[PDB]
Design a protein around this ligand. Structure first.
Ligand SMILES: O=S(=O)(c1ccc(CN(c2ccc(O)c(O)c2)S(=O)(=O)c2ccc(O)c(O)c2)cc1)c1ccc(O)c(O)c1
Ligand SMILES: O=P(O)(O)OC[C@H]1O[C@](O)(COP(=O)(O)O)[C@@H](O)[C@@H]1O
Ligand SMILES: O=P(O)(O)OC[C@H]1O[C@](O)(COP(=O)(O)O)[C@@H](O)[C@@H]1O
Ligand SMILES: O=P(O)(O)OC[C@H]1O[C@](O)(COP(=O)(O)O)[C@@H](O)[C@@H]1O
Ligand SMILES: O=P(O)(O)OC[C@H]1O[C@](O)(COP(=O)(O)O)[C@@H](O)[C@@H]1O
Ligand SMILES: O=C([O-])C(=O)[O-]
Ligand SMILES: O=C([O-])C(=O)[O-]
Ligand SMILES: O=C([O-])C(=O)[O-]
Ligand SMILES: O=C([O-])C(=O)[O-]
Ligand SMILES: [K+]
Ligand SMILES: [K+]
Ligand SMILES: [K+]
Ligand SMILES: [K+]
Ligand SMILES: [Mg+2]
Ligand SMILES: [Mg+2]
Ligand SMILES: [Mg+2]
Ligand SMILES: [Mg+2]
Lengths: 425, 425, 436, 422
């Protein structure tokens, strides 16, 4: 029904193995990736990637999140970067085949015992300019996150807080930090200086695993393709690092000086895209999903229950995609936490949410703009078909394919409770 | 609550190993769940009175077996009439009415190589009188099943064929027999004579396991509580046998002499009910579900996909029940095959499907008698409410409990594709 | 199949069809059940020991000789019936029947003698009659005591005190027959040498439909502890009057073995039944089948995960030896034991290889029947001047009795477990040997 | 305090996800570094004084790249390495043997090139222990190298370098006839897409681990350390992941041969390896290796599993094995024990060659045989306990597993013994 050639692609013989050792032995270099690249790419916006024309090329190469490093440059400079990014993103708003929303992240300068005076001004700037994510520098304890949450005035409560663990104190207080944070960033640059360089990989692997268990996005950062600042190709250690960060379970991967000041910014985005696609295919979903399932506590939350039921169903039929109607992005995040092999096409009316779901691995946002139907059930079905139309368009779906549709019983966020098995018409 | 997690061997079912599970079995941990394993009671002079049968229904008789090896067609027609009169004596309360299937156990081929002439007449009688299940005696190969299917004719298309494996040939050709049969019966009486008595348990355990893997109902039969033919209580070996048949994975357990001619017909049914309730609580669902999940093949069938997703969701929230609408009973059978701990409350308008689902373990049928609503979605919701009301009335459900609702996208059999997480109001 | 492709070519495809070997190689328990073949015959010797109650139907020296041949390992004397004089004659008839095969020490089968106490009855502890019966057992050299109605750890202490200083070697198997005993099980097992699941009284004290949970829990806890457990009462009840048992009785016996019972017992089936030798033969047949169908893959891995880390050389050598035995499909594990402890420590890991235990102690040789898979050999030769030579002569005695009784054939691999110095407690050496 | 060190809370976890969550940066490694370090000998690491520092930093195998330099040049490198290694021979309980590996030029456009035959003959004449065969494509290429060593080069180990697509495809036939494999990522990253190299590395390492043969991870492991004193976050990650994958050896190419920091790179690889080995999830690893290993009727193979199982039960400090060829130690290594495999051998070539196996710590026994064989065996077991105690592997009170045979000569290993230290 699917074919012998289908079961050779995207490391399907390796993922069917009864053991992890057998899985490794079945990894085929001739087994090509079919699924879209799920791990998002954070690109640092600097002089080498600041023109509306250069930004248009980086969006095409695969940039999902645009990072503004507030350690360098004025508020006036970063406001122009925000405008150039928004102008480059809206240049494809006519065509829904090239239109992809891009999140804007503010990376704070850093602390001093707590939130610095400059950081309060920078955070206030981010709120006034509508940033989606905040990369809080040098988070040490839960009170540091609370300080950043407080500095995000009456307005900025929707902004996501990704705590950067860059020192020994934060590594030790990790559990309390993650509890109050929206996600974590393994800031390996400063971490490699505060703690022994040979212990950084344990912190990365521990934090990624704990984030995966918690269901919160984790970013792997610093020197991923460092040689790409001056060279067109990365070293064997750099491609290995990127691939292993994806394998560890990182939701996002990041380019710092490779995109901000490097001679090769578009090339680095293209390279990260290529390695991520390969690595995701080699993920051992059999053990991953069973462990995530066993480790996850029992839940009486319909969204959480529908999320595991949907991912279970998606694996059973090899669903092409899981279409989820979300408003805040929560439902899509809860699907992503179980690491499905099917792309989570998330249809939202919230432009902020559509940008913010790039933080979650495997979530492909669609901003649906249409005017609402008088009947709610009809409005839900127009958003579902919109999911299918775009899926068909961007290569995810073909007629005959199976998809899992996740919706709620009534309007408003938090009522997700339905999972539907749908055949593409 | 604390008290909830002490009942129905919940500490034992949470164990990381099967050895730990056994060590955590508490005799003071009472069963809460309803008895899922159905009870087949052989009809005889000890069980023909309408008043007596009413007591047997109350004790838990689900299937009434008519042994065609004894008695005339006239005799069995009076049996059918007494079973039906006794079952219909509780039709006045449709939320607490228990349907009872009627199974015809053929005389057999005897000396003959295939379907005997008497068997053709008996099968035609079964069809004319509306039997639900046929227990084909001495099935030796797949052609024997085909012969019985042919003898039922076009009017007996709906009747289920449970092949009785009673000899060595039938044990060897098991795979071909099970392939063409609706289910199997481990006929231990004749099997204990055809094969060495000390090898019968291996045939029982093999057949039960293979049936469980296939998703087809399996019946454990003969001498389960033999001493109760004359004595008020069974031996320590008999209670152990019944409990182990349930633990092995038998969908149904059966009483022959115990209910046909014995002095304790009602008490035998009460005893089997009691042991089954205890055994089901002690089932190690942690390993059972994970093995059944792993062993099941990939499917592109929406009913099959929704079934595994629903059972997975039911386990995540400790669902009180899974309410499924079904025409043929297939949807309920597909939920049953994954051995959920939640009761599969199956609502159906088909009286034959409601009787036949007793073959599947954990399926509690409800016959919906109301005439259809003009709007199909309203008619579906009225049947879901009928299920919640009967569930609440019979003690399956309490307000605050979570329930998984399984429905389809259009009327008619084959279209189940929706799973819904619902909280009892 | 790559993890058996080489050994299937060597040992053969016919070897890997017998004793439910395709079923035991399955990756899941569900797959194991699907691979159970009725045409797969048992090759190994019957490991689960058979306790037979000695009564009028099984008292003559000639009848006892037939029951030993049929497979009786332990002879139970029920002190709830009969006088001390009566039980002394039973002891004499059993000993006479056992010693009638002493002429061939490579094919002589030792039989343990167990005393089943009358019980406390109305009383709160050890009855006055029980004290007299226990002193009788000590005076007559019984190997095991089946303490009736044990309810707390103080009850077993009372029985150990009543045996006195002369009855220190006797094993105490506590019978759990009531709700109190089931609840205080952990404290009872801690101070007892083993347990007996007395299902007759247990089926009366607790609901009959709850007895199987108590049996399965107690057996599992005993298996975890490494102590012998006995399944008792109504196992083949219909054979008291009938030549063949019911489908429920064969099922019960097979399931008790599967649960992990070290011993199975015949009460009124042999004491007063019309077919006492037939019941022993039947229990032997069902046990051999059931042991083959044991899912050793998960059983051994669970027993290893559940067992705590040990710094005891005997305990360490025991797990290392059982692991080695499984790697090469060892025909047997030959262990030199004084008290039986080393053989008990091998048994707790439930090896598929037969634990052939060579001991000079006649009481230990009788008492190791309590452990499943231990086949005792009583070494009667006088010691060699060199200890290493004396050890090698006992190892050869084991290989010769193993070859003679069919356990071993030339080409088979065996695991030899010995110590570094004489005396009990010094087991620390494991040796892989090929049968010559 | 013992159960907090060397990631013991993480290794006790019931799941691999839980294992990752329990990784503690404050949990220090106690055990010795098992993964061997191959250092490429070049101009930056040629002096006897510089080599002595690299031996102290952790070098176990010295690689001679025959793609550059004359036979005269490589003979001087061999002499300088041997002089630096023998400078610590005065203390035989704390002397570290170093293997010498010859990395062939390759076939290039061509089977076995004419230069390769001359280079292989040179290695035989100079007593090399290992040969890193460049660009192996099929089983006949390995046979060609074995033929070129001749009758004098039987003892030399052949590590086939998989550097192209053909070699990756015919991997099963190559590994079957080779002594081990080297994942040559430099050329492999050019022949196949760079983003597919990690799949080849992970596949080859897993297949080698299954086979029980040594595997080497090679090229650009700490590349930035050629010009900088510290590596990038990607490079430390790469090294740690190669160890985690199951590589028996890790290699420094231009980082030791021509880099400004050759001793620093050896020190860095040692540090990352020690940390990574502690974070290995032995619970699942040993159970998977046990399940995956076929049944064997070979006493050495059987005693090897039995000994590793016993070592895990008592948390044995070390497994002392008496070996002649190194085979018994290799068979213990394949089950990846947490206990150090202290291997006592009289053969100097075997003692150098066991660096190819992860977790095998060679000891060269330099005393002449006792008249009684049992006494000679006990003296070698004591030599192992004394060197263990001396080098910090053992403390009084620790438990050790001793693996010996029933008679002298190779292939008769069949005994396992539980021993308590002093
Ligand atoms: O390998 S085992 O025999 C075993 C038995 C049962 C199960 C678990 N069931 C199970 C798991 C998956 C299935 O597909 C299935 O049909 C049954 S169970 O809990 O359902 C069960 C419980 C009780 C039984 O009598 C029985 O036969 C089975 C696993 C391993 C074993 C292993 C370890 C022990 O300590 C020990 O006493 C026995
Ligand atoms: O992921 P979220 O934010 O909780 O949103 C889930 C909600 O979105 C829906 O799927 C769509 O409903 P809306 O029409 O209100 O967007 C709801 O039925 C459900 O309550
Ligand atoms: O299990 P079956 O036989 O497929 O019946 C399930 C069917 O019942 C329904 O749930 C309800 O349909 P009906 O209105 O015909 O009763 C269908 O949507 C579904 O196809
Ligand atoms: O099982 P036990 O009672 O500990 O006996 C094991 C003992 O038996 C031996 O193997 C042989 O002992 P003996 O020389 O005393 O007969 C000892 O080396 C070891 O200490
Ligand atoms: O690892 P190898 O080469 O098989 O060597 C193992 C051999 O070493 C020993 O342990 C000691 O052997 P030697 O007396 O030859 O040194 C033997 O008993 C065994 O045969
Ligand atoms: O700021 C950062 O991201 C760092 O230091 O790694
Ligand atoms: O007919 C039966 O039920 C049998 O043979 O078991
Ligand atoms: O005494 C017994 O054996 C019993 O009660 O079962
Ligand atoms: O020769 C090598 O090692 C390479 O090319 O990687
Ligand atoms: K910054
Ligand atoms: K019949
Ligand atoms: K008694
Ligand atoms: K070269
Ligand atoms: Mg920083
Ligand atoms: Mg019959
Ligand atoms: Mg009693
Ligand atoms: Mg090369």
């Amino acid at each position: 029904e699917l074919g012998t050639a289908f079961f050779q692609q995207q490391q399907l013989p390796a993922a069917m193995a009864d053991t992890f050792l057998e899985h490794l032995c079945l990894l085929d270099i001739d087994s090509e990736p079919v699924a879209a690249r799920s791990t998002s790419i954070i690109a640092t916006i600097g002089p080498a990637s600041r023109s509306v024309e250069r930004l248009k090329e980086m969006i095409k190469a695969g940039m999902n999140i645009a990072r503004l490093n507030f350690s360098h440059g004025s508020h006036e400079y970063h406001a122009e970067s925000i405008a150039n990014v928004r102008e480059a993103v809206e240049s494809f708003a006519g065509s829904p085949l090239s239109y992809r929303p891009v999140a804007i992240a503010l990376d704070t300068k850093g602390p001093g015992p707590g939130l610095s005076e400059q950081d309060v001004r920078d955070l206030r700037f981010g709120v006034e300019h509508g940033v989606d994510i905040v990369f809080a520098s040098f988070v040490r304890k839960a009170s540091d996150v609370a300080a950043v949450r407080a500095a995000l005035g009456p307005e900025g409560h929707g902004i996501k807080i990704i705590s950067k663990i860059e020192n020994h104190e934060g590594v030790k207080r990790f559990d309390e930090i993650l509890e109050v944070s929206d996600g974590i960033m393994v800031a390996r640059g400063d971490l490699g200086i505060e703690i022994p360089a040979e212990k950084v990989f344990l912190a990365q692997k521990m934090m990624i695993g704990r984030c995966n268990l918690a269901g919160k996005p984790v970013v792997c950062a610093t020197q991923m393709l460092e040689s790409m600042i001056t060279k067109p190709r990365p070293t064997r250690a750099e491609t290995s690092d990127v691939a292993n960060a994806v394998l560890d379970g990182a939701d996002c991967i990041m380019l710092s000086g490779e995109t901000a000041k490097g001679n090769f910014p578009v090339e680095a985005v293209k390279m990260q895209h290529a390695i991520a696609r390969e690595a995701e295919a080699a993920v051992y979903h059999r053990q991953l999903f069973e462990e995530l399932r066993r480790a996850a506590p029992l839940s009486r939350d319909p969204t959480e229950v529908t999320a595991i039921g949907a991912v279970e169903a998606a694996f059973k039929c090899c669903a092409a995609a899981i279409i989820v109607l979300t408003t805040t992005g929560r439902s899509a995040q809860l699907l992503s936490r179980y690491r499905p092999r099917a792309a989570v096409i998330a249809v939202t009316r919230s432009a902020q949410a559509a940008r913010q779901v790039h933080l979650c691995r495997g979530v492909f946002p669609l901003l649906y703009r249409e005017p609402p139907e008088a009947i709610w059930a009809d409005d839900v079905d127009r958003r579902v078909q919109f999911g299918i139309e775009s899926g068909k368009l961007r290569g995810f779906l073909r007629v005959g394919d199976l998809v899992i549709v996740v919706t709620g019983w009534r309007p408003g966020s938090g009522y997700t409770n339905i999972m539907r098995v749908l055949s593409i018409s």
